[PDB]
Amino acid sequence: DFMKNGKWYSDRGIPYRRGYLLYGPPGSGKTSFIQALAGELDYNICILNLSENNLTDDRLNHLMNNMPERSILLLEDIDAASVTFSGLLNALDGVTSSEETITFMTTNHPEKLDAAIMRPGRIDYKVFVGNATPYQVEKMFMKFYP
Amino acid sequence: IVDLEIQSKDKSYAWFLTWMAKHPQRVSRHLSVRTNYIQHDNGSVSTKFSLVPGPGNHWIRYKGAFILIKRERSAKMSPFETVTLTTLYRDKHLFDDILNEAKDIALKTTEGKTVIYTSFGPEWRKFGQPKAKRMLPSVILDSGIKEGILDDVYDFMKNGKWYSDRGIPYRRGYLLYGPPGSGKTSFIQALAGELDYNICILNLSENNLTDDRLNHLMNNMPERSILLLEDIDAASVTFSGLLNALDGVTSSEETITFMTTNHPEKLDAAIMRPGRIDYKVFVGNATPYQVEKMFMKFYPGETDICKKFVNSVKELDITVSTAQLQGLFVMNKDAPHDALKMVSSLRNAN
Amino acid sequence: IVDLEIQSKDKSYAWFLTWMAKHPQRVSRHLSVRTNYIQHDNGSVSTKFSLVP
Ligand SMILES: Nc1ncnc2c1ncn2[C@@H]1O[C@H](COP(=O)(O)OP(=O)(O)OP(O)(O)=S)[C@@H](O)[C@H]1O
Ligand SMILES: Nc1ncnc2c1ncn2[C@@H]1O[C@H](COP(=O)(O)OP(=O)(O)OP(O)(O)=S)[C@@H](O)[C@H]1O
């Protein structure tokens, strides 16, 4: 729906940018699902590590603005947080924020994240990739033992 | 018998390069390649290229004048490093003409857009391609806030000499404090687009920033621009240096600055002085007026459905933000009934 | 038969540059460009330039 409705965002003056969050326990299939969705859309993942010390706010903004086309931004363990909190917030949703980009975030400790980062404008969709459930167990068994 | 000119690292430099590139009488003896992806809307996407001229000697027959051009880099280059352009001919009465045509090409691109400038050392530069204007009616705020701010800004811009005659610095500062996702920065964008000004975003938490660099940046801003300080409560810059820069001897003139916070309580009294922050506005959470007008914006014509939606929102008794409403309407795109059904989703936050 | 002088990074340096710039007998064989915005008060605003030597 987001990818198809391109002009609809512009006609109503919204930034054509969306962000997804997949929070859950470890080994729940989060990053695997990121890989699979990127493959399904034929997009290229642009992994980014914010805990990188040499990273700076200007470098961050340039990187998120000069991404290769047909790509998905990935921020594994966004709860880890030279980058600044305000700089990150403005980069995700702000004047310097880019356009026509999809970003995916993952955590095991969503409680650490504040309210501003979890704003709908920055994290539009949030999903709980929880532990295994009987449906998941059954379907995994069929996958491995058809 | 011949005359020449040099320029490097200047506003006209890129304008000049674009003007040379488009020109059909180019006799470029050295070429380059610029690869780019072409998007055929949602129909398809493919990759293409453009043979930008390379460094070396190039001839142009500009309306009866055989002009030679020379592009060369410094010893090295992608950190900033000087690149210069030269142009050779006897008569200069076509020189300014070429420069004006390059200006026109530059103006064409920045027609319905708002340029954004960023701080890189003691001077600014454009950040990325320009973005389309965020028209003010798209920005839904509480009653009278937008009108009051616009009236204040127009009064300030128009009354230029009045400040000087009475010995006041012709500089004004606005503050928009409120919860996240309340439309602050969106309103900044919209006002900048309405005035046709260019935002010069500045991050003070930047460690490499210094007081002298700060003063130079706020004094060498491009004209017809608005300074923006997102999250001024974040605070190598010094408190006294910032205070003097905003309102002090070294402070510039004929500038408009906008500040935003979610924690105005952190700010001290001196920074909130009227001379530095003349106007302060509370961009609070959504109110029934804002909810209604947002619904009309996203679902025009749906009046009764709006009435039921606002009644349900009131009955929910939640401190819903404007961005939450935008997200809900985006989920239920062109589906007012679905938005009414999912109205209960706003209550949850985690 | 001829005499000379040097100066660099001095109070008179910029003063000297301005004096050379205004002078009408300049035979400047090398030129530059200085772009600046001209404000016609509140009536209008436009961008112009000056070919500094
Ligand atoms: N839902 C799932 N579907 C398929 N394979 C899964 C799933 N969950 C776990 N796995 C397998 O177990 C591995 C661990 O899960 P991952 O998705 O790699 O990590 P994750 O904990 O889900 O998220 P992060 O970002 O790695 S903490 C995967 O690489 C798969 O081999
Ligand atoms: N009053 C509003 N009018 C229009 N759109 C709004 C409004 N409030 C929120 N939005 C939407 O939700 C997003 C979040 O609001 P923003 O204005 O970007 O952030 P803000 O929290 O208001 O201020 P900062 O500086 O980002 S903390 C906007 O980009 C719009 O898409």
Side-chain angles (χ1 to χ4, degrees), chain B residues 119-311:
Chain B
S119 48
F120 169 67
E123 80 306 348
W124 306 91
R125 70 250 291 280
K126 295 164 50 50
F127 178 85
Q129 75 312 9
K131 342 179 74 172
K133 311 221 212 294
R134 172 66 171 288
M135 315 309 335
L136 277 156
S138 78
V139 189
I140 309 313
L141 300 170
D142 203 344
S143 36
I145 302 289
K146 218 199 305 204
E147 295 82 2
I149 293 157
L150 264 283
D151 299 323
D152 196 313
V153 169
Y154 282 127
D155 198 351
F156 164 83
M157 299 213 341
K158 157 158 50 48
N159 284 304
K161 78 186 302 316
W162 179 98
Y163 272 65
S164 72
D165 307 310
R166 313 195 179 188
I168 298 105
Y170 187 49
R171 141 169 50 73
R172 186 157 263 273
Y174 299 82
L175 183 73
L176 306 182
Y177 62 96
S182 68
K184 290 174 255 52
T185 175
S186 159
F187 172 79
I188 302 306
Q189 246 174 10
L191 174 54
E194 169 52 31
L195 308 175
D196 216 312
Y197 278 45
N198 325 131
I199 305 113
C200 296
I201 186 61
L202 181 60
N203 190 0
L204 297 162
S205 310
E206 203 283 282
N207 274 40
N208 190 19
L209 183 59
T210 88
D211 297 323
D212 186 54
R213 197 199 310 290
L214 170 60
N215 289 119
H216 281 289
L217 286 165
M218 304 196 339
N219 205 279
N220 314 136
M221 275 180 6
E223 315 205 28
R224 298 273 305 292
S225 47
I226 286 160
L227 184 73
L228 177 52
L229 311 176
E230 289 269 59
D231 285 286
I232 196 44
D233 57 356
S236 91
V237 72
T238 66
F239 176 55
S240 59
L242 176 73
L243 282 191
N244 290 299
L246 298 175
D247 175 36
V249 172
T250 177
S251 89
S252 159
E253 204 86 64
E254 197 175 355
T255 86
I256 300 157
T257 177
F258 275 87
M259 276 150 300
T260 71
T261 56
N262 302 111
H263 314 118
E265 54 267 6
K266 296 183 161 73
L267 308 192
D268 78 300
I271 191 74
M272 302 267 273
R273 182 209 287 159
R276 286 184 194 103
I277 284 155
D278 315 273
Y279 205 52
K280 44 166 56 46
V281 198
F282 172 57
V283 189
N285 288 304
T287 75
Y289 167 67
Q290 273 179 119
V291 178
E292 155 161 60
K293 298 309 303 306
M294 277 254 160
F295 196 104
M296 320 318 305
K297 190 194 76 168
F298 280 107
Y299 306 126
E302 317 299 351
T303 63
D304 55 302
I305 306 109
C306 200
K307 152 165 56 45
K308 285 143 65 53
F309 175 79
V310 297
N311 297 135

Side-chain angles (χ1 to χ4, degrees), chain A residues 53-79:
Chain A
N53 274 40
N54 190 19
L55 183 59
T56 88
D57 297 323
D58 186 54
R59 197 199 310 290
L60 170 60
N61 289 119
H62 281 289
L63 286 165
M64 304 196 339
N65 205 279
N66 314 136
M67 275 180 6
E69 315 205 28
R70 298 273 305 292
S71 47
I72 286 160
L73 184 73
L74 177 52
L75 311 176
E76 289 269 59
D77 285 286
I78 196 44
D79 57 356

Side-chain angles (χ1 to χ4, degrees), chain B residues 13 55 70-78 81-84:
Chain B
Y13 195 76
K70 157 56 56 52
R71 170 145 33 72
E72 63 276 64
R73 302 183 170 186
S74 109
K76 273 288 186 179
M77 217 36 39
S78 286
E81 187 54 69
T82 60
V83 192
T84 193

